[PDB]
Design a protein around this ligand. Structure first.
Ligand SMILES: N[C@@H](CCC(=O)N[C@@H](CS(=O)(=O)O)C(=O)NCC(=O)O)C(=O)O
Ligand SMILES: N[C@@H](CCC(=O)N[C@@H](CS(=O)(=O)O)C(=O)NCC(=O)O)C(=O)O
Ligand SMILES: N[C@@H](CCC(=O)N[C@@H](CS(=O)(=O)O)C(=O)NCC(=O)O)C(=O)O
Ligand SMILES: CCCCCC/C=C\CCCCCCCC(=O)O
Ligand SMILES: CCCCCC/C=C\CCCCCCCC(=O)O
Ligand SMILES: CCCCCC/C=C\CCCCCCCC(=O)O
Ligand SMILES: CCCCCCCCCCCCCCCC(=O)O
Ligand SMILES: CCCCCCCCCCCCCCCC(=O)O
Ligand SMILES: CCCCCCCCCCCCCCCC(=O)O
Ligand SMILES: CCCCCCCCCCCCCCCC(=O)O
Ligand SMILES: CCCCCCCCCCCCCCCC(=O)O
Ligand SMILES: CCCCCCCCCCCCCCCC(=O)O
Ligand SMILES: CCCCCCCCCCCCCCCC(=O)O
Ligand SMILES: CCCCCCCCCCCCCCCC(=O)O
Ligand SMILES: CCCCCCCCCCCCCCCC(=O)O
Ligand SMILES: CCCCCCCCCCCCCCCC(=O)O
Ligand SMILES: CCCCCCCCCCCCCCCC(=O)O
Ligand SMILES: CCCCCCCCCCCCCCCC(=O)O
Lengths: 145, 145, 145
């Protein structure tokens, strides 16, 4: 039932809105610096905005996948919390990279800590789930000896 | 249970098939205009096909995320319906852009209306869910005064 | 409940880890061949690594979508099994393309067989679900004649 996935859904919707915002920013960079489709190259201040949005998009599914698995197999509140930390780091990251390639790095690391953490949680939950029955089945086999 | 997510799953599968179709089109553009990996630049009629598929791919997860959240927290039939409208607009869009950069714009707007709508529905559902208990908890605090 | 989606979640987490691995490889190619953001072009041995990771990323959501739909509407164990075959083929594929454009093709086909199979399963499950009630409703209409 939806009472226990509603935080996860809320963080998920927040991520969509963020990605929508990045997209709108790439659209307005195209106008500002007059880079027009096709063509994803131009002035470097255009390319940084483009690349920031693309880098963010290529991680969105990873964040989602791992958000849901961690949220369901570990603990919904903790997952949602990393989710927010991740997304906020992704904001700071899109804004950094737009000013300066070098500014992308600090918030990239922040976003990596939060994401790696969700992975750790996802793996721990699935261990907790699969490990008991696996160890029991192994031990049953050792009977008798 | 799966009886109430089956439309959403159906629209989801339709989207996968569409993306598969875009991919196959990029493969055959590579043959036709002899642009070969790596290399994502070449004749402009190659680049438009490439970029159409990529633009579509970068939105696929947004459509999915928001399709499921709207479908579950608002109303499954309405979500599926926007889903179809969105995907159909994405077809017209891939076909437009392939002929002509300028032809991409009309169906892009159509796809944006349908997607923004799913976002509106997603947000309304989550409001309906979180707002009652939030307002009650607030009011309980004002007792007594 | 989570007892019947736990394999799917396990394969899902495996896919995230794989994508994380591809990403780390693109980062270290940037160092090795000194190609630095923005800029996604450089020596061809850089571009092949870049393109391998991107091609993989653009399919990750398709794999996920279809993995979950097949897993839930057909059979969880079979879906997870294709999932593994797919991911393993995607590994061999990232490693091939990095050495040589031509080496990408064999494992690309392997990954396409496994993915098309998940699509077949997804479609069969949804048929099994929608077709009975559709045919009944049709037949009820033919009464009386
Ligand atoms: N990655 C996209 C993000 C923004 C976007 O989706 N833009 C639309 C509208 S517009 O900016 O062209 O008006 C588009 O069709 N982009 C073309 C493309 O992605 O090739 C881009 O580079 O444009
Ligand atoms: N975006 C892809 C879409 C189609 C695709 O996945 N193509 C395969 C097969 S092929 O067209 O090369 O035969 C590939 O490995 N593409 C290479 C790549 O994505 O760098 C592309 O540009 O090629
Ligand atoms: N597709 C990415 C994959 C790896 C990645 O995410 N790299 C980070 C860190 S770094 O390699 O630059 O240190 C980044 O911000 N990449 C810049 C970008 O994607 O434009 C890329 O081309 O870089
Ligand atoms: C791509 C992420 C998959 C999301 C899986 C969600 C499964 C929810 C069902 C369990 C309800 C408790
Ligand atoms: C990325 C989108 C997440 C999909 C979440 C699906 C959760 C389904 C469980 C609720 C069943 C009623
Ligand atoms: C993008 C893929 C959507 C995943 C949908 C998962 C729905 C799970 C609910 C059914 C539980 C049995
Ligand atoms: C417990 C903390 C979880 C907070 C999730 C709320 C998400 C709001 C985003 C809109
Ligand atoms: C899996 C997230 C990507 C990690 C990139 C940041 C680490 C720097 C080295
Ligand atoms: C019954 C097969 C169980 C094997 C699943 C392995 C899950 C490992 C999770 C990490
Ligand atoms: C369900 C029964 C639990 C089986 C006990 C296995 C013990 C190993 C856990 C440590
Ligand atoms: C109520 C209308 C919903 C229609 C969804 C059907 C999807 C069929 C796609 C194959
Ligand atoms: C969130 C979808 C992208 C919107 C692009 C169309 C709006 C044109 C300005
Ligand atoms: C208990 C925490 C509730 C906060 C969740 C906020 C959801 C907002 C949805 C829009
Ligand atoms: C569950 C109980 C509902 C609490 C009533 C809160 C009223 C505010 C809604 C308008
Ligand atoms: C039945 C076979 C399913 C195997 C799924 C196990 C996934 C382990 C990946 C870590
Ligand atoms: C849908 C997966 C992509 C298919 C690419 C391999 C087929 C070669 C022609
Ligand atoms: C009630 C509407 C049913 C139509 C759904 C069509 C699903 C087709 C699945 C392939
Ligand atoms: C639920 C009742 C099943 C209806 C029977 C329809 C028969 C068509 C299947 C072949």
């Amino acid at each position: 039932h939806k009472d226990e996935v509603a935080l996860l859904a809320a963080v998920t919707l927040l991520g969509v809105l963020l990605q929508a915002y990045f997209s709108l920013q790439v659209i307005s960079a195209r106008r500002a610096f007059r880079v027009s489709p096709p063509l994803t190259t131009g002035p470097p201040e255009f390319e940084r905005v483009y690349r920031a949005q693309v880098n963010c998009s290529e991680y969105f599914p990873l964040f989602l996948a791992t958000l849901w698995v961690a949220g369901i197999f570990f603990h919904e509140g903790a997952a949602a919390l990393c989710g927010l930390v991740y997304l906020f780091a992704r904001l700071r990251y899109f804004q950094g990279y737009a000013r300066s390639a070098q500014l992308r790095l600090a918030p990239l690391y922040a976003s990596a800590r939060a994401l790696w953490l969700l992975v750790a949680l996802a793996a721990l939950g699935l261990l907790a789930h699969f490990l008991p029955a696996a160890l029991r089945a192994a031990l049953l086999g050792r009977l008798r000896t």
